[PDB]
Amino acid sequence: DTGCGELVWVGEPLTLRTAETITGKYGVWMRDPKPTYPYTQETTWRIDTVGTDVRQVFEYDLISQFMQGYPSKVHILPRPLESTGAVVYSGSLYFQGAESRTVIRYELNTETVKAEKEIPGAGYHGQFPYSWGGYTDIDLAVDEAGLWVIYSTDEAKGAIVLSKLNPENLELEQTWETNIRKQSVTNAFIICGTLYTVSATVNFAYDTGTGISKTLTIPFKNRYYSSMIDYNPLEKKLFAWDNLNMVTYDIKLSK
Ligand SMILES: [Ca+2]
Ligand code: NA
């Protein structure tokens, strides 16, 4: 099976690159599931996120360049970025502005800010982080249906809220409220419209198509806790960052 389904298994972490400074103890790395010319499914981006003025986005045309640590281009964001929640989708980096609830769409090839929007009511900067902290209040996500944001609000009393985002202008299209305390999980990601969390196990699922939540006990092996765990719907794999290590996981879905 190569299409959508429920997550039933996660493999062992594979380390693709280890960061060589403590600035990269935590970070985000990713590929675009809907690559826009001139990028391809091999293009990789990396951001080392320790510090207070994070602006450099490393871009690698080839996986070989990413694995040897030699960027083909460095983008300098026009404003500082917060935490590890950013994603790339359809040619744009979507990231959170430092010390804000603002999500910014930055078109990578043209180096152009295309949109900026507050996520209504979202906590930020240490209000509803994932368990380990890192100011991980706001976590963007891509699945087979496009762009989402994972956050919480005072209205939700710290439970995970997720919203589908319009990728062009960042407007919220639809919002769901779960019963999972965001501060109680290590990270979260969306696969085939279901939110999954990692405690280690994949321990909760919330299906946006039905509104039904499930407890799970799928083993999740950490290379060494993850500061970032995202899903790539083109590869159908998890991408993670664990103590300097940029890691990927095979998964199995069952329809
Ligand atoms: Ca995530
Ligand atoms: Na994310």
Was 230 annotated as part of a binding site?
Answer: yes
Cβ-in-10-Å burial (0-12, 13-18, 19+) of 128 comes to buried
Q: How many angstroms separate the Cα of 70 from the Cα of each of 41, 45, 63, 213?
A: 18, 11, 10, 43
Strand-pair partners of 24: none
Was 139 annotated as part of a binding site?
Answer: yes
**Contact, 196 vs 186, CB < 8 A?**
no
Instruction: State how far the Cα of 55 lies from the Cα of 255, in Å rounded to an integer.
Output: 41
Determined by: X-ray
Was 1 annotated as part of a binding site?
Answer: no
Amino acid letter at 119? I
Was 229 annotated as part of a binding site?
Answer: yes
Distance 136 CA to ligand 1 centre (A): 9
Q: How many angstroms separate the Cα of 161 from the Cα of each of 63, 77, 126, 191, 207?
A: 34, 27, 16, 16, 12
Distance 200 CA to ligand 2 centre (A): 19
- Side-chain-facing half-sphere of 28: CA atoms under 13 Å: 30
- The CATH classification number of 6-254 equals 2.40.128.630
